């Protein structure tokens, strides 16, 4: 049972590092991304009309 307990110790210990790094790339990609699709699309239908 102790072994099982430190199993989850290590699981969260490394999953936290994975989570923070993935959050870093998420912040970068969110700054790069926003929601610019609708801006692209709206001019498209405006021009076609």
């Amino acid at each position: 049972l102790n072994a099982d307990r430190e199993r989850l110790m290590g699981m969260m210990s490394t999953k936290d590092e994975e989570f923070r790094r993935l959050n870093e790339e998420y912040e970068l990609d969110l700054k790069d991304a926003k929601a610019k699709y609708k801006e692209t699309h709206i001019k498209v239908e405006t021009t076609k009309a």
Binding site: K38, E39, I42, K43, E45, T46, T47, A49
Partner: protein, 85 residues
């Protein structure tokens, strides 16, 4: 005995343009021949598209995702009722 400008003005009534307003459109095309502005109507069309995109950006995301085919002529009537001023 009928002016060509009068002819185009009256013939712009049968049909309603998808986004362009029909009455200011006739006004601009008539102005082309009236004051001899060889390059007139492109300012009108660019202003119209710039105003239309700005107006549509003011709406919520739910409204635009649900539809866009109706808001364009809604803002078109907005444009004509502005043109009277």
């Amino acid at each position: 005995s009928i002016s060509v400008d009068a002819l185009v003005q009256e013939f712009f009534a049968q049909q309603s343009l998808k986004i362009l307003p029909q009455a200011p459109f006739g006004d601009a095309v008539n102005q082309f021949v009236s004051k001899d502005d060889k390059h007139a109507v492109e300012m009108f069309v660019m202003d119209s598209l710039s105003s239309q995109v700005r107006g549509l950006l003011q709406l919520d995301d739910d409204k635009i995702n649900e539809g866009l085919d109706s808001h364009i002529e809604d803002f078109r009537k907005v444009m004509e009722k502005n043109f009277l001023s």
